[PDB]
C-alpha cells in the first residue's frame, strides 16, 4: 500500500504581453485528477480523473476561488520577488509552489511538504517538522520573517496534516477503481547483438501503475552496473508508465546474466534469463 | 440550508457569566473560521479567527472548532456590558451567518422599578409614558395596541455618580390613553 | 492610515435610478467584498475581487454591476435601483484570501433606502419631555425623553446637547427607529431617547437641554413639485430649559 | 481539496 | 537563474505492429524553463494534429510534458521528435526505434 | 544570503594544535561576535567587532584570537587547542549595535571536542529493536527503538528513514547523548531513539524502516597507525522489516 | 558570572498553562533586553525584545521589563510542549545568562504505564527494556547498577494519529538484567515473556 | 535652577582613508564629564569632571562600545550620504549628531532631541512630542521611512524621557560640588574715551557659572542696542564664563546710561553707573 | 550616560 | 557645503596684572567646516606649548574651541593669536587687549 496527495502550481512572467501564465494541477499518487490554466477559455477548475466529477456547484466553486487565488498570489509574488532581486521587468521569471500529504497502508499521516522556488532554484521550503523554515537567500529571509508573523508554518500544518488526509482518503475511496489498482509490469528480453564480438540484452516493462519500479541485472547471481544503461521511466498517455534496462555482454554469457523487476502488482520479485 | 447557519437568539446573559455563541457550516470544505463583532449601526469587527481544531484562546474570548460536526464557537469568560452587541460568524472571510444579538443585562444593585408621566415642552395633553428603574429580571411587554408605540428597554450610564438605570418609553397618537397600557412587572409608583 | 472609507453614507433613490456607490484602500489589499444586511438577517455577499480586473459573483448578485481594474478602488452600482436593495451596504478588504491571520477590515457601510414615490420621505417631528417631580424626589434624578416622529426613510442621528456642549453620559437611545405602520411596507418611523442628570441639575433655571436629530432626507438636486416643504437633509430639534417650580 | 489557508504572497 | 536542458524519449504507447494505428509519444523532462517547442515528424515534416499533457516538475524542480498523437507505424517510414529550448544553439531530433 | 555561515560544522582537535573557524554575513552587519555554550552553561561572549577594524575581548577571551579584515568576515583562532575548549562555538551578527529591532542572527555553530590522545575517537554501534507483541496487543501500536553506542566526539545526527523517505511525526531523539561512564573524564557515549507507528503499518511486510546515525570523526588527511577501522565520519544505519507478528 | 542571572532549570509546567521565564541583569543603564529560544541540538533565535518599561505582546509571547527592578520576563500563554527548550536572556544582544531549560510535559488523557521487552532486527540475543505510555506526573530516576544505562523520559507527538506517548529506554551489558529498573509507578503490563 | 544632560558628537571625512576623525563630548548643564576621540591613544570614554571617574570597569567598558559604535554609525552615515546627495569622495563632509534632556527646578524631566546635521544644514531633527520627524531634503525622507521601520522615535523617546533622567539625576547628586553650585558674575565698567567728542563704557562680568546670562544698557532707563557692541560669551578654562557689553555716549551723559546684569546666581538684578 | 537604542545608520 | 568664518575673541582668564603669570585664551567659534588651525603668538613667534578644548557645537551647528597656554603679562611684550580655516585667504591674526 501507500499513497499521496499534492498540488503543483506554476506561474512564469510573459513581458509585454498582459498577466503570467498560471497552470496548477492535482495529482493523487502517479494520477491527475484537476488542472487549471490562465489561458483555457472557462477560469474554472477541470476534472481529468473520473471520480472527482461526482462533486457538485459547493467543490468546483470554491477550488476554483482558491487556485484563481493562488495564481493572483503568484502574479504579485513575481512583482515582489524583482524587488527583493532588482531583476528586469524585461525577463521572463518563473515560481513554483508544491504542497501534499503522504499516508501509509493504514492511510494515516507520514509527511507533509510546501516548498517554493524562483526561478528553479529553492527559494523558501518548509522543514519536515512543519514548524520550521529554510531559507536561502536574505529574499527569503524578508519571507520568513513575514510568513512567522502570519504564522504560516502553523497554518498549513493544519492544512497537511488535516485536510490533505482528509480529503486524500475521500479520494482514495469514492475513486477505488482508479487509485487503487496496482497494474503488474509485462516483461521480455530482446537480443540485438551490436557487433560480432558483443551482445546487448534490454530488459522491459510496460502497461504497469504506479510509476514506482526497480529492474536490476545480476552477474552469476550479482549487481552488475558496469556496462548497465536504465531508461527515466515514462508514461504512456493511457495512465500506465513504461521502462527498460540493458546490459553489454560476452556473447556466449547470456544465461549467465539475469534481469530483475520489483513492482507493487507483483505478487513475488520477477527473474527473467534469455528465451 | 444557508451556506453558514448561526443561532438566533436574541441571546441575553447576567454580566460577569459565560456567554456561548453557536454557528454551522454546510460548505464541508472550509479550512478558516472567523468571528466578527458589530455594536448596533456601526461595522463588523474581526475578534477571532480559528484554522484548525480545537481552542483559541484570546483574553476574555475563546474560540472552538469541529470540522467533524462542522461546527464553530465561541466563549465571553466575565461578559462585560460594552460586550452588549451582534456577534457574525463567517468562513473563509467570505460567508456569514444571520447574528446572534447579545445583551450582557447590567447588575442592579437596589432597583426602584416606577412609571412616571413626563410632558413635553410649549404644549399640553401631548405627553410619553417612562418605565425606568426596573431590574434586568423584569422584561418590557409588546405595544398590544396598533395605534400605541413602545420602545425596547436600554441602559444609562451616569458616570457622573456610578448608576446604571433600565428605561423604555410609551407614547399613543392620542390622550384617550393613559398609563395602564404597559403590562407591568414590579411595582408602579405614580 | 485612512482604513477602508464609503460614499455616500445615506441615500434616498427612485426605484428605477442609477447609483454608485464608493470603496477604497490605503493598504496593498488584494482580496475586496461587498455585503448587504437586511434588519433581521446579517451580512450576504454579492460580488468579491481576489484582485485586480478579477471579479466574482457571490450570493445575491442580481441587480448589482460591480467590478474593479484597481486594486485601491471597488465601486458597486445599481443600474436600475429597487425597493427589494433597500438595505445597508458593507465593503471589506483584507491583505488576502486563501490565510487567515491578515485581518478583513470593514467600511463604514452605506445606508440605501429606494422608494416607488420620492413623496414617501418626510423629516422628523421632535419634542422634548420634561422630568416628573415624582421621579425627582422619589429618585433624586430628573430623566428627559426625546421623540423624532413621522420620518422616511429612517436614516437619523440623534445626540443631547446640554448648555450647547454634547453629552454621552446617562444617554439612551433606542437600538433601532421603530416602525409607526410594521404591516406597510414604505411606513413613516419614529426613535425616542432619554437623558438623566443629577436631580440639581434639573432644578437650576440656568441649565439649557436640547434634543438634536440630523435627518438624511433629499438633496438640493432632487426635483420636487408638491405643496409641503422640501424634504431636504436637515437637523430637528425640540428645547427645554431647567426648572425650581 | 486545495490549500485554503497559509498560502500567502512572498 | 537555472537553465537545465531537456531530455528526450520518443517510444509507441503499445508495442509497435506495422498497419495497426497507436500512439506517437515525445517525452520532455528535466528542463527549465517552462517555455519549450516540440514538434512531431514523418519523415522530417511536422505532424500537424498533436495533444500535450499538462504542465508539472519533479522533486528538483525540473519541468516535464509527454507530446503525442495517433500514428500506424510503417516498416519503411520513420517518425522522430524536433525538441527546440532556449538551453540549446540547433534544435534536437530524437528518431524513434520500436525497441528503443 | 542565508543569515550567518559558519566552518566547520563538527571538529575534532588534537590537544596542542591550530584552528580557525569562519563566519561570514553578506547582510552590511557592522555588529558581529562569538560566542561559547557548554552543555549546562550558556553563551559567554570571547571577542566583538563593532565595525571593521575595530574588534573587543568579551568575558572568556584567552586561548582564544580574532580578527576584522572585512564588514563581512569575522574569523576565530584557537592557537593552542585544550580541552578547556571544547564547546559549541556560536558566531552572531546584527545590522545594529545600539539599537533594539534590527535583530541578533546565529550561525549554525561550530561543533568542538579537544582529546589528548586521538585514539579516544570511535564511531557508533547502530541497532534497532523491533516492537513488543505485547505493546502492539495492549495498545494497537508500534514503537521501534534505535541505539547508538561506544562512539566520541559526543555528536552526530539520528533521523529515521520509512521506506527511503525521511520521516519526523511519532519519532522522539534523546535531546543530548548520555555518558557510558560520567565519572571518567574522555569516556565513550551513547543515544538512544523511538519511532511510533499504527500497529497495523508496522503488520504489513512491503514497509521499510532504517534508523541512521551520521558520524563527525576524523578526515581523510588525519594520521592513523591504529589496527582498529580509521573513525573517519561516516554514516551507520541499522534496518528492520515490518511482520505479520 | 553575574552579568545576567536567569532562573537556571530545569523548569517544568503542564500543557496549556503559563510558562514565567525570569531574568535580572547587573549592569543598571542596560537599556536593550532580548529573549531568545534554542531548541536541543539548534541554535538561539531571537523570539522577544522590549527597550521600554512594561509589558510587550506578540502573539502567545508577552515580554516584561521593569527597570527599576532590573528585571526582564516572559510569558508563553497556553503551552505547547513543541515550546519546550531553552529560554536565554541578554542585554543589548551582548551578554546572556546560563538558559532556563523549559519542559512542557503534555496532557495524557488516557495513560498506559508498561514496561515491553523489544529484541533487535539483527542478533536478537541484544534486548532492550522501553517504559512507555505512563503519565506526565511519573518521574524517572537514572540507574543504580553502573553497568545499567536509563535514557530521560522524552515525548512523541505521532501525528499518525495524533496520540503523545511519553517514552524512556533502558539497557545492560548482559541478561543478568531483565526489565529490573524499580523506581516509579502501580501499573505496567510488564509480561515475563 | 534647571538642568541638562546632551551628548554631541562630530564625524568629519577625511578623503583617501576610509576612518573619519570621530570627537564625542558630554556635558550636563554647561559642565563637561566625558570625551572620545578617534586620535587619542586610548580608544576609550575618558572622564573629565571629578564625579564621573566613582564610576566602575561597568560604565566604561559600555559607555566605550556605544560610542564606539556611535562613530561607526557615522561611519557609515557618510558613505550613504555622498550616494543620497550625489557629492565627491574626494570632499571632506561633516555629520553631527546631538541628543539630551532638561529638568525644571524640580529635577522632573521638562524636554528631550534627538538632532543631525550633513555639513552644518539640519537633516533630521524629532519633533518635540518624540512621536514625529521634521525631514527637509528627500534624503532625510528616505532616512524617516527606515527610521519609522525601525521604531527609532519610540526607541528613543524611552531613553530622552527615561534613561537620560535617570543619569542626569544621578550625576546631579553624585556632583553636587561640581553642577549645583551658582557662581555670580564679579561685575564693573572701564570707561576709555575714544576722543573729546565720545566715551565707551564697559560693563564686565567675570568669574561665573553656569554661561546663562544678560547684560543689557539703558538710556534715561530704556534697554539700547542703537551703539550696543555685545561680545559672544566666552569660557575661561578655570570652568567659569566671561561677557562684557559697551555703549558709546556723548561725553557729559555717562550717569544717563546704567548697566543690567541678570544671572542664576545674582538674588536681584544688578544696576551699574560710572564712578 | 550615552543611548544604547535610537541609534542607526540613515 | 554652507561655509560659515571663525569668530576670534583674544582674553585673559583673570585681569592681567604686569608680572603676574596668567592664562592666555584664543577662543574661535560659529565656523564650520571643524577642520581649523590656531596659534597664540609672543611679539609673532609661536608660543610652543598650547593645550585645546576638546570640539564641541553651538544650537546652529557651527563649532567651538578654546586655545589656551600659560603665559605672564608684559607691558611691552605683545600677544595675538593666528587663526587659519579653509573660509580665510591669509591667516586672521587678532592682537590680545587687556579691556578686551
Given at each position: 500500500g501507500?499513497?499521496?496527495?499534492?498540488?503543483?502550481?506554476?506561474?512564469?512572467?510573459?513581458?509585454?504581453?498582459?498577466?503570467?501564465?498560471?497552470?496548477?494541477?492535482?495529482?493523487?499518487?502517479?494520477?491527475?485528477?484537476?488542472?487549471?490554466?490562465?489561458?483555457?477559455?472557462?477560469?474554472?477548475?477541470?476534472?481529468?480523473?473520473?471520480?472527482?466529477?461526482?462533486?457538485?456547484?459547493?467543490?468546483?466553486?470554491?477550488?476554483?476561488?482558491?487556485?484563481?487565488?493562488?495564481?493572483?498570489?503568484?502574479?504579485?509574488?513575481?512583482?515582489?520577488?524583482?524587488?527583493?532581486?532588482?531583476?528586469?521587468?524585461?525577463?521572463?521569471?518563473?515560481?513554483?509552489?508544491?504542497?501534499?500529504?503522504?499516508?501509509?497502508?493504514?492511510?494515516?499521516?507520514?509527511?507533509?511538504?510546501?516548498?517554493?522556488?524562483?526561478?528553479?532554484?529553492?527559494?523558501?521550503?518548509?522543514?519536515?517538522?512543519?514548524?520550521?523554515?529554510?531559507?536561502?537567500?536574505?529574499?527569503?529571509?524578508?519571507?520568513?520573517?513575514?510568513?512567522?508573523?502570519?504564522?504560516?508554518?502553523?497554518?498549513?500544518?493544519?492544512?497537511?496534516?488535516?485536510?490533505?488526509?482528509?480529503?486524500?482518503?475521500?479520494?482514495?475511496?469514492?475513486?477505488?477503481?482508479?487509485?487503487?489498482?496496482?497494474?503488474?509490469?509485462?516483461?521480455?528480453?530482446?537480443?540485438?547483438?551490436?557487433?560480432?564480438?558483443?551482445?546487448?540484452?534490454?530488459?522491459?516493462?510496460?502497461?504497469?501503475?504506479?510509476?514506482?519500479?526497480?529492474?536490476?541485472?545480476?552477474?552469476?547471481?550479482?549487481?552488475?552496473?558496469?556496462?548497465?544503461?536504465?531508461?527515466?521511466?515514462?508514461?504512456?498517455?493511457?495512465?500506465?508508465?513504461?521502462?527498460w534496462a540493458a546490459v553489454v555482454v560476452p556473447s556466449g554469457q547470456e544465461q549467465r546474466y539475469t534481469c530483475h523487476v520489483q513492482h507493487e502488482g507483483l505478487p513475488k520479485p520477477l527473474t527473467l534469463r534469455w528465451e | 440550508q444557508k451556506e453558514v447557519e448561526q443561532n438566533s437568539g436574541p441571546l441575553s446573559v447576567?454580566?460577569?457569566?459565560?456567554?456561548?455563541?453557536?454557528?454551522?457550516?454546510?460548505?464541508?470544505?472550509?479550512?478558516?473560521?472567523?468571528?466578527?463583532?458589530?455594536?448596533?449601526?456601526?461595522?463588523?469587527?474581526?475578534?477571532?479567527?480559528?484554522?484548525?481544531?480545537?481552542?483559541?484562546?484570546?483574553?476574555?474570548?475563546?474560540?472552538?472548532?469541529?470540522?467533524?460536526?462542522?461546527?464553530?464557537?465561541?466563549?465571553?469568560?466575565?461578559?462585560?456590558?460594552?460586550?452588549?452587541?451582534?456577534?457574525?460568524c463567517a468562513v473563509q472571510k467570505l460567508v456569514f451567518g444571520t447574528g446572534t444579538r447579545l445583551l450582557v443585562s447590567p447588575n442592579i444593585?437596589?432597583?426602584?422599578?416606577?412609571?412616571?408621566?413626563?410632558?413635553?415642552?410649549?404644549?399640553?395633553?401631548?405627553?410619553?409614558?417612562?418605565?425606568?428603574?426596573?431590574?434586568?429580571?423584569?422584561?418590557?411587554?409588546?405595544?398590544?395596541?396598533?395605534?400605541?408605540?413602545?420602545?425596547?428597554?436600554?441602559?444609562?450610564?451616569?458616570?457622573?455618580?456610578?448608576?446604571?438605570?433600565?428605561?423604555?418609553?410609551a407614547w399613543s397618537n392620542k390622550s384617550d390613553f393613559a398609563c395602564a397600557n404597559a403590562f407591568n412587572n414590579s411595582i408602579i409608583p405614580e | 492610515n485612512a482604513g477602508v472609507t464609503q460614499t455616500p453614507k445615506f441615500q434616498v433613490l427612485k426605484t428605477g435610478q442609477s447609483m454608485t456607490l464608493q470603496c477604497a484602500q490605503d493598504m496593498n489589499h488584494?482580496?475586496?467584498?461587498?455585503?448587504?444586511?437586511?434588519?433581521?438577517?446579517?451580512?450576504?455577499?454579492?460580488?468579491?475581487?481576489?484582485?485586480?480586473?478579477?471579479?466574482?459573483?457571490?450570493?445575491?448578485?442580481?441587480?448589482?454591476?460591480?467590478?474593479?481594474?484597481?486594486?485601491?478602488?471597488?465601486?458597486?452600482?445599481?443600474?436600475?435601483?429597487?425597493?427589494?436593495?433597500?438595505?445597508?451596504?458593507?465593503?471589506?478588504?483584507?491583505?488576502?484570501?486563501?490565510?487567515?491571520?491578515?485581518?478583513?477590515?470593514?467600511?463604514?457601510?452605506?445606508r440605501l433606502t429606494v422608494t416607488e414615490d420620492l413623496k414617501n420621505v418626510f423629516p422628523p417631528e421632535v419634542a422634548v419631555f420634561e422630568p416628573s417631580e415624582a421621579e425627582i424626589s422619589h429618585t433624586q434624578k430628573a430623566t428627559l425623553v426625546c421623540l423624532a416622529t413621522g420620518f422616511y426613510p429612517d436614516h437619523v442621528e440623534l445626540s443631547w446637547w446640554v448648555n450647547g456642549k454634547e453629552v454621552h453620559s446617562g444617554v439612551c437611545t433606542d437600538p433601532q427607529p421603530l416602525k409607526e405602520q410594521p404591516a406597510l411596507n414604505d411606513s413613516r418611523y419614529a426613535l425616542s431617547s432619554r437623558l438623566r442628570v443629577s436631580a440639581t441639575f434639573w432644578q437650576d433655571p440656568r441649565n439649557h437641554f436640547r434634543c438634536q436629530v440630523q435627518f438624511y432626507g433629499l438633496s438640493e438636486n432632487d426635483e420636487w413639485t408638491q405643496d409641503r416643504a422640501k424634504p431636504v437633509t436637515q437637523i430637528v430639534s425640540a428645547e427645554a430649559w431647567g426648572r425650581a417650580d | 481539496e486545495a490549500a485554503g489557508i497559509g498560502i500567502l504572497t512572498v | 537563474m537555472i537553465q537545465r536542458t531537456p531530455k528526450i524519449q520518443v517510444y509507441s504507447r503499445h508495442p509497435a505492429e506495422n498497419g495497426k494505428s497507436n500512439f506517437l509519444n515525445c517525452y520532455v523532462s528535466g528542463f527549465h524553463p517552462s517555455d519549450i517547442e516540440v514538434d512531431l515528424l514523418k519523415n522530417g515534416e511536422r505532424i500537424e494534429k498533436v495533444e500535450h499533457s499538462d504542465l508539472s516538475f519533479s522533486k528538483d524542480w525540473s519541468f516535464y510534458l509527454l507530446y503525442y498523437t495517433e500514428?500506424?507505424?510503417?516498416?519503411?517510414?520513420?517518425?522522430?521528435?524536433?525538441?527546440?529550448?532556449?538551453?540549446?544553439?540547433?534544435?534536437?531530433?530524437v528518431k524513434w526505434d520500436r525497441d528503443m
Amino acid at each position: 500500500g501507500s499513497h499521496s496527495m499534492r498540488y503543483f502550481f506554476t506561474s512564469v512572467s510573459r513581458p509585454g504581453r498582459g498577466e503570467p501564465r498560471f497552470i496548477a494541477v492535482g495529482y493523487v499518487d502517479d494520477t491527475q485528477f484537476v488542472r487549471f490554466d490562465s489561458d483555457a477559455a472557462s477560469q474554472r477548475m477541470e476534472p481529468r480523473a473520473p471520480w472527482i466529477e461526482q462533486e457538485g456547484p459547493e467543490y468546483w466553486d470554491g477550488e476554483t476561488r482558491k487556485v484563481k487565488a493562488h495564481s493572483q498570489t503568484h502574479r504579485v509574488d513575481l512583482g515582489t520577488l524583482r524587488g527583493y532581486y532588482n531583476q528586469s521587468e524585461a525577463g521572463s521569471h518563473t515560481v513554483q509552489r508544491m504542497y501534499g500529504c503522504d499516508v501509509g497502508s493504514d492511510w494515516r499521516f507520514l509527511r507533509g511538504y510546501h516548498q517554493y522556488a524562483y526561478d528553479g532554484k529553492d527559494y523558501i521550503a518548509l522543514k519536515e517538522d512543519l514548524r520550521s523554515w529554510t531559507a536561502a537567500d536574505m529574499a527569503a529571509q524578508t519571507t520568513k520573517h513575514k510568513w512567522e508573523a502570519a504564522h504560516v508554518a502553523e497554518q498549513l500544518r493544519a492544512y497537511l496534516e488535516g485536510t490533505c488526509v482528509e480529503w486524500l482518503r475521500r479520494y482514495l475511496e469514492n475513486g477505488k477503481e482508479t487509485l487503487q489498482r496496482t497494474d503488474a509490469p509485462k516483461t521480455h528480453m530482446t537480443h540485438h547483438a551490436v557487433s560480432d564480438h558483443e551482445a546487448t540484452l534490454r530488459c522491459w516493462a510496460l502497461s504497469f501503475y504506479p510509476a514506482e519500479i526497480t529492474l536490476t541485472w545480476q552477474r552469476d547471481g550479482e549487481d552488475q552496473t558496469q556496462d548497465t544503461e536504465l531508461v527515466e521511466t515514462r508514461p504512456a498517455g493511457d495512465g500506465t508508465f513504461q521502462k527498460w534496462a540493458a546490459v553489454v555482454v560476452p556473447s556466449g554469457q547470456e544465461q549467465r546474466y539475469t534481469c530483475h523487476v520489483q513492482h507493487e502488482g507483483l505478487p513475488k520479485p520477477l527473474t527473467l534469463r534469455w528465451e | 440550508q444557508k451556506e453558514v447557519e448561526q443561532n438566533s437568539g436574541p441571546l441575553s446573559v447576567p454580566e460577569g457569566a459565560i456567554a456561548s455563541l453557536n454557528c454551522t457550516y454546510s460548505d464541508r470544505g472550509s479550512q478558516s473560521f472567523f468571528w466578527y463583532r458589530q455594536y448596533s449601526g456601526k461595522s463588523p469587527e474581526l475578534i477571532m479567527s480559528i484554522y484548525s481544531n480545537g481552542d483559541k484562546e484570546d483574553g476574555r474570548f475563546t474560540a472552538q472548532l469541529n470540522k467533524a460536526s462542522q461546527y464553530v464557537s465561541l466563549l465571553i469568560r466575565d461578559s462585560q456590558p460594552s460586550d452588549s452587541a451582534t456577534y457574525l460568524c463567517a468562513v473563509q472571510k467570505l460567508v456569514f451567518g444571520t447574528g446572534t444579538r447579545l445583551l450582557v443585562s447590567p447588575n442592579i444593585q437596589n432597583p426602584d422599578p416606577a412609571v412616571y408621566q413626563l410632558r413635553d415642552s410649549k404644549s399640553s395633553d401631548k405627553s410619553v409614558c417612562l418605565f425606568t428603574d426596573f431590574d434586568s429580571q423584569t422584561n418590557v411587554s409588546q405595544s398590544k395596541d396598533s395605534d400605541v408605540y413602545i420602545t425596547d428597554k436600554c441602559v444609562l450610564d451616569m458616570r457622573s455618580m456610578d448608576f446604571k438605570s433600565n428605561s423604555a418609553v410609551a407614547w399613543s397618537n392620542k390622550s384617550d390613553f393613559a398609563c395602564a397600557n404597559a403590562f407591568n412587572n414590579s411595582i408602579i409608583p405614580e | 492610515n485612512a482604513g477602508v472609507t464609503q460614499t455616500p453614507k445615506f441615500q434616498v433613490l427612485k426605484t428605477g435610478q442609477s447609483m454608485t456607490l464608493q470603496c477604497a484602500q490605503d493598504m496593498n489589499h488584494e482580496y475586496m467584498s461587498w455585503y448587504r444586511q437586511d434588519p433581521g438577517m446579517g451580512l450576504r455577499l454579492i460580488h468579491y475581487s481576489v484582485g485586480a480586473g478579477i471579479t466574482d459573483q457571490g450570493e445575491v448578485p442580481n441587480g448589482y454591476n460591480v467590478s474593479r481594474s484597481t486594486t485601491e478602488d471597488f465601486p458597486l452600482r445599481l443600474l436600475s435601483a429597487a425597493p427589494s436593495q433597500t438595505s445597508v451596504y458593507f465593503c471589506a478588504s483584507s491583505y488576502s484570501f486563501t490565510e487567515a491571520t491578515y485581518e478583513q477590515y470593514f467600511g463604514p457601510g452605506t445606508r440605501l433606502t429606494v422608494t416607488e414615490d420620492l413623496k414617501n420621505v418626510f423629516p422628523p417631528e421632535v419634542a422634548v419631555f420634561e422630568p416628573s417631580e415624582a421621579e425627582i424626589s422619589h429618585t433624586q434624578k430628573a430623566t428627559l425623553v426625546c421623540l423624532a416622529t413621522g420620518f422616511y426613510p429612517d436614516h437619523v442621528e440623534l445626540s443631547w446637547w446640554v448648555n450647547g456642549k454634547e453629552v454621552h453620559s446617562g444617554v439612551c437611545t433606542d437600538p433601532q427607529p421603530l416602525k409607526e405602520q410594521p404591516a406597510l411596507n414604505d411606513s413613516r418611523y419614529a426613535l425616542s431617547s432619554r437623558l438623566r442628570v443629577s436631580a440639581t441639575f434639573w432644578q437650576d433655571p440656568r441649565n439649557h437641554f436640547r434634543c438634536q436629530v440630523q435627518f438624511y432626507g433629499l438633496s438640493e438636486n432632487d426635483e420636487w413639485t408638491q405643496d409641503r416643504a422640501k424634504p431636504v437633509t436637515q437637523i430637528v430639534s425640540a428645547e427645554a430649559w431647567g426648572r425650581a417650580d | 481539496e486545495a490549500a485554503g489557508i497559509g498560502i500567502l504572497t512572498v | 537563474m537555472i537553465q537545465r536542458t531537456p531530455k528526450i524519449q520518443v517510444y509507441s504507447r503499445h508495442p509497435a505492429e506495422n498497419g495497426k494505428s497507436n500512439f506517437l509519444n515525445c517525452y520532455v523532462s528535466g528542463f527549465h524553463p517552462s517555455d519549450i517547442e516540440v514538434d512531431l515528424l514523418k519523415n522530417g515534416e511536422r505532424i500537424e494534429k498533436v495533444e500535450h499533457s499538462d504542465l508539472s516538475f519533479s522533486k528538483d524542480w525540473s519541468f516535464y510534458l509527454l507530446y503525442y498523437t495517433e500514428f500506424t507505424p510503417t516498416e519503411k517510414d520513420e517518425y522522430a521528435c524536433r525538441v527546440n529550448h532556449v538551453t540549446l544553439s540547433q534544435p534536437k531530433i530524437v528518431k524513434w526505434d520500436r525497441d528503443m
